[PDB]
Amino acid sequence: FGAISSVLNDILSRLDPPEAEVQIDRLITGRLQSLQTYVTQQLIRAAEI
Amino acid sequence: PVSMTKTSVDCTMYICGDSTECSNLLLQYGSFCTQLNRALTGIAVEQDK
Amino acid sequence: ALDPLSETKCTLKSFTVEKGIYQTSNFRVQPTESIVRFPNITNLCPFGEVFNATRFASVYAWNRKRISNCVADYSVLYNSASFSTFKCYGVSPTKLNDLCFTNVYADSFVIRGDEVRQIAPGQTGKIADYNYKLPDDFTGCVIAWNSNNLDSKVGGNYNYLYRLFRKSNLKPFERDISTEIYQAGSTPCNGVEGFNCYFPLQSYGFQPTNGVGYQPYRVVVLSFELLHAPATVCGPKKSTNLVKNKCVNFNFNGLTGTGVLTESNKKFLPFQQFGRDIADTTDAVRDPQTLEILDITPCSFGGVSVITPGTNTSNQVAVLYQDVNCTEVPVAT
Amino acid sequence: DLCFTNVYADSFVIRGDEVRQIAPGQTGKIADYNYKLPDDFTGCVIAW
Amino acid sequence: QCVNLTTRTQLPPAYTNSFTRGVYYPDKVFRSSVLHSTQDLFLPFFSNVTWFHAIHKRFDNPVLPFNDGVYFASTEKSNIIRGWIFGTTLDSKTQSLLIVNNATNVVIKVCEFQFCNDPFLGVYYHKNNKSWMESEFRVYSSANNCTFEYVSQPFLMDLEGKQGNFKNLREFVFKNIDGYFKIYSKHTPINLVRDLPQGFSALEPLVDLPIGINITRFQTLLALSSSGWTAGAAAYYVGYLQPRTFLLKYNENGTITDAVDC
Amino acid sequence: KVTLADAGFIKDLICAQKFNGLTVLPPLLTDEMIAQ
Fold first, then answer.
1. Nearest CA to CA, how far is A30 from chain B (Å)?
2. Chains linked to F by 3 or more Cβ pairs within 8 Å
3. What is the H or E stretch that residue C127 is in?
4. Spatial contact of A35 and B15, defined as CB atoms under 8 Å apart
């Protein structure tokens, strides 16, 4: 999602907080968008069933 | 078809998996996760109905 | 947090709870202790051969030395006030004390005191286009400090020379040595020299009474890369004993995590040192001191549901732990 | 055109090159040993 | 020293089809029972590889280009391929990489060497003592500046063997990326006559070398008064890698079982 | 005839899903009460 790693603990075990926060924000944004996509498609499939 | 599988997702283990700094950063986004758990719980009840 | 009825009242934002079942916050077994496993390397790293070196070559012939198989210590490098600038780019200088690397590179040269800003990746300038270019995905540290007294003489140490003109910009981590003459004019140039036929290498005016910004600065670059290989260069961390079948915090060569280590059945090939999941999480690891393969399993968890009648009837509840055998509830969020 | 609760004035003297180190989040000698600012700092720094 | 040998038959080069060869482990991370797609330099399936041969007469060690890596292969009896030369101008203005796997050592040099027209190795032939002994090392004459060096542990390989069919099958991939020289390899015993096997095998990574040179040409060395000699039966194959997405199948053991070229 | 997937009995790919916060709840009516 634009950050330096897909592993959260590798960001935590490498960088101090004031710029590790910026990478963690990109991870949070991408993963939250994936959850919203999944929930919307599950709602529509539940309507069909 | 009558029903589909009842699936539950937990945000804070999915998004900020076992971290404290990520949890504190996630609290600035308000109430997305209660919304997602509410929607998925609604689907899981409607299957048994 | 006092009792599950209170927690249900908290997560519903009400003081009256009607009859039913409510999913509430999860439970997670807490880890008991920490495990650190680092290899058995003892010798220190030859840092005096780099920093207290007698001679640095010129920037267009920069010297590269490979640091391997030692125990580094970046606290003694960071705490010295001798360094004028010390900036680390892929890491923070604090955490360098407890990471382990595969091999370290040391690049050494000398530069004019104002061209140091051109050494960062993405910036463009004289030496950035002609002498030494860094990749934009750089992971390492840049250290620079003036060496005014030691090399610059009043007669002028004119052995420090750098390339002025180049045919095209060069790819990072490369080097050119040449005696070729340069054709800045339209006409081709042969022989030795002619009109606008320039020798591309020109020397600095390093003499000590010159003002700052024309001074000689010694510059060293560290260019280690991270955690995709068996590790050689560690920091000063002492290994503990190895504890299995308990939720522990493991630190395997800088790979950090929490879980249960189990004797495995996976048969690693001898060139492999990790093992990943579909979701890019490590689930097998090789102990760097005793060459054995350990499985990593995350600790037990699950949802917790509160079954209540209405609060208008009574204040008694029952608790459901989802998909967990009962014996793991007394042990423990 | 703002109003505040109360204002604090911190006074000291350092070397002329460590003034770069007084900003919060960056580290070094004077940041780790003598005077540290919080990362959520609001206010001004004045040096001359 | 070197001798300009000429006594050989002249033939056009031969072409052969690289059926399902040229796949290696792209990283050192164990994966199991999963289908993983990667994008890297590989040898494409059903590509046309150049075949060079030495029989009886036949001795061809030509200058070949080096663009974005080489799949080398060698099908062989009696261990006649030994050497590997890498460089960009080869004439004492740039350093040269050399691998020499002779009867004694594995000598790996990165030196400012000086070469000539016909550099090669050579041994004498069964000179009434039931053995072939090394007698000929005419590769270079000068070495000015030599930064890296390595000599491995001593040993002794065999220098005899007479079969009509090869049994040694060596597969190699040589790459140079970002100043790193990467060697991947595999050995296989096989029963074949005059071509490349149709089959599947992966390549383990073997060696990284931190060289940092620019290589655009390469040339192979073969084992053998100034003329009149016998060449052992040997065949070797050259192919070139391309940036092509692959799909890889890892089994339970983490062993690459099949691949699909995209 | 139907090849069930993601059964999620307490104890492969199902556990790999399970360790990242993905759970499967059991239905209220079993497979025997429906047959009744």
1. 9
2. B, C
3. helix C126-130
4. yes
Cβ-contact E69, E239 below 8 angstroms: no
Task: Compute the half-sphere exposure of residue B40: CA atoms within 13 Å on the CB side of its CA.
Answer: 23
HEC-encoded secondary structure of chain B:
CCCCCCEEECHHHHCCCCCCHHHHHHHHHCCHHHHHHHHHHHHHHHHHC
Helix A17-48 vs helix B32-48: crossing angle, to nearest 10: 20
* Calpha distance C234→C71 (Å, rounded): 5
- Whole-number Cα distances in Å, C210 to A24, B47, C114, C153, E156: 48, 83, 13, 11, 64
What residues form DSSP beta bridges with C112?
C216
For residue C82, the one-letter residue type is S
Please name which of C173, C177, C175 lies closest in space to residue C105, comparing C-alpha atoms. C173
- This structure was determined by cryo-EM
Q: What is the Cα–Cα distance from E145 to E190, expressed in whole angstroms?
A: 42
For residue F15 the two structure tokens come to: 């556990």
The closest CB to that of A9, out of C94, C99, C257, belongs to C257
H helices present in chain C, as ranges: 4-12, 48-51, 75-78, 126-130, 148-151
Q: Does C298 contact F at CB distance below 8 Å?
A: yes
Q: Name the residue among B3, B5, B17 with its Cβ closest to that of F24.
A: B5
Q: Which residue of A has its CA nearest to B46?
A: A46
* Chain C and chain A touch, per 3+ beta carbon pairs within 8 A: yes
Residue identified by tokens 């482990």 is E25
SS3 C17: coil
Cβ atoms of E65 and E234 within 8 Å: the answer is no
Chain C neighbors of D27, CB-CB under 8 A: 93-94
Contact A16 C92 (CB under 8 A): yes
Look at residues E14, E2, E100, E109 and name the one whose alpha carbon lies nearest to residue E55.
E14
By the 8 A CB rule, do C258 and C299 touch?
A: yes
Among partner residues B25, B39, B46, which is closest to A28 by beta-carbon distance? B25
Please give the structure tokens belonging to residue C67: 């640091």
3-state SS assignment for residue C96: helix
CB contact, 8 Å: C257 with chain F?
A: no
Closest CA to E210 of C50, C108, C136, C102: C102
Neighbors of chain C with 3 or more C-beta pairs under 8 Å? A, B, D, E, F
Kind of pairing between the strands at E29-30 and C274-275: parallel
Query: What's the CA gap between C207 and C215, in Å, rounded?
Result: 8
- Residue E67: count other Cβ atoms within 10 Å of its Cβ: 11
DSSP chain A: --SS-S-HHHHHTTS-HHHHHHHHHHHHHHHHHHHHHHHHHHHHHHHH-
Residue A36 C-alpha, separation from nearest chain B C-alpha, in angstroms: 8
Q: Residue type at C220?
A: V
Contacts of A16 in chain C (CB under 8 A): 92, 94-95
